[PDB]
Each structure stands twice: as C-alpha cells, then as structure tokens.
C-alpha cells in the first residue's frame, strides 16, 4: 500500500523516496526507469519496493548539480532520451573483425559504425564530460552500450532513423580535447580592413569541414568580407597529432599503390549506407558494419578522410 524506492541520476548517489499506490510514479515523483523500463505511468506496487530507479525529470537541486557536473549543460529531455536509447541499443552487438571491433548492422545504425571506428583511430583523445569519458573508456574495454547511447543522445539521434556519419562525428568531436597541443594559424587579409590572424587551438585545429585534401585545405581561400569587398584566408602554420577533413560525398578512385597520405576514410553509398575504410599494409580494409573485406582498389564516395599529424609552416608571404 506504500513503498520505498531509491532514486538516482548518476548510479552513485541515491535518495530514498516514499510512494503510495494512489497515483502513478509520474504524478508523485517523475519520469522513472526501472532497469531500462519506463515505469512512469505505472501505479507503484510491492514489487518495486527497495529497488533502484533512474529519474529523468523533477530533480532535486542536488541532482541537478550532479547532472550538470556529470553530463554537462544538457536540455531537460536529455536524461529521458538517454535512458530510452540505452535500453533500445542494449541488444546491439560489437563484432570482432580483423582484431578490430565494429558495430553490427541493425536499425539503420551503419552511420554509427563509421563514427565509432573513426574515433577508435584518433590517438589520445579524451572527453571533457565525465559521463562521456567513462563511457568511452568502458567502450574501449569491450562494453559499448553506454557510449553508443550517449553520443546518440548528445547528437539528437533517433533510434532506428538513418543519419549522417560526418554530422555525428563532428558533433561528438566538439565535446573532446587533446592530450598534446595543436595549432592552426589562418592569415586573413582585405585591401580595406587590413590583415588579421585567426588562431584555432586543440581539437578545433584537427577537424575541418569543407575540403577533403590537405592541398585544398592549405590553399588560398577567397570569400566576401564584412565590408563587402574581397577577403582572403590561408593557413600559414599547422601543427596537429592527426587531421580529420570532411566533405560531401565525393566520387574518387582510391588505390594502393601509390600510397595515399591518409590512413583511413569513410564512404557513403546511394536511404544510404556507410562504410569505414582503413589503409593497412598496402590494402584498403573495408569494414561494412560487422564485416571485413580487402581490395587494393576502390571506386567509392569518400566523406571523412583521416590524415596523420601535420607539421606545416608556410614559406610564403601569403599576403603578397
Ligand atoms: Zn574588408
């Protein structure tokens, strides 16, 4: 007729809550998850007495603090969306392929395979957000469920919907940080406004959206200045541990040999499908969502391309 439950937001700190059987959990407490089940619209009964619940809204001040410290500044629906995802993707299998883990195709999740396999190549990145960092470590140790559900929640991904690998990869990488230093110095100039430098540091210096080759990235770019005249930009210095370049699907013929400068790339095939590729030992290792395959030549549409560390200084006075 009345029960006691433990309520948490972090799996560490629980508060005791007393409930009766005269309204639903949602009326008395909030949106609650009991071992992955949304029992919010249930009338509490004996079989939940003593059990631990995850709360997703109507937090105490102390819980709101732990939420922000653990997950970051998230929107109200976050915890709800995360709990749902965590449960929905529990059944996803991480298949071992050529000694590398890959995400088996289920529910249009092919884009997540490209994302996770690409992240696994990125040397020495950590996530600022503790919950995400713990999940990532847990993922590298063989349990990928929390990490998959977390990046899906932060990325506003919907279970079962097809999505874009480049989109999520950059959205996830926006929440990371490097162990070393990284620098990118853009030199900008206009004949009216004058000359200024724009520096990007750390993770913002390793990722770029809009070109897919280093030659195009390092090129003089011309656009319209805020004064309406002609403005120019050019990388004048670039030091990074790796470089991820992303563009729209680009039909290309990848061959070995000659040795490409890039160590991996992602491909789109067109709902659409995503394949992760690595260059290892003079071959292209195609990872098709739990599947491997090897070829020396591939005509594919590349999207993201991953390069090794950059050590670049211009030996040109780019302004003249
Ligand atoms: Zn100008």
Swiss-Prot record:
Catalytic residues, chain numbering: 110 (for pl-pro activity), 273 (for pl-pro activity), 288 (for pl-pro activity)
Domain Ubiquitin-like, residue spans: 1-55
Localization annotation: Host membrane; Host cytoplasm
Binding site for Zn(2+) 3: 190, 193, 225, 227
Domain Peptidase C16: 70-320
Mode of membrane association: Multi-pass membrane protein
Catalytic activity: Thiol-dependent hydrolysis of ester, thioester, amide, peptide and isopeptide bonds formed by the C-terminal Gly of ubiquitin (a 76-residue protein attached to proteins as an intracellular targeting signal)
Zn finger spans (C4-type): 190-227
Function: Responsible for the cleavages located at the N-terminus of the replicase polyprotein. In addition, PL-PRO possesses a deubiquitinating/deISGylating activity and processes both 'Lys-48'- and 'Lys-63'-linked polyubiquitin chains from cellular substrates. Participates, together with nsp4, in the assembly of virally induced cytoplasmic double-membrane vesicles necessary for viral replication. Antagonizes innate immune induction of type I interferon by blocking the phosphorylation, dimerization and subsequent nuclear translocation of host IRF3. Also prevents host NF-kappa-B. signaling.
Protein name per its UniProtKB record: Papain-like protease nsp3
Species this protein is from: Middle East respiratory syndrome-related coronavirus (isolate United Kingdom/H123990006/2012)
Range of the intact protein held here: 1483 to 1806 of 4391
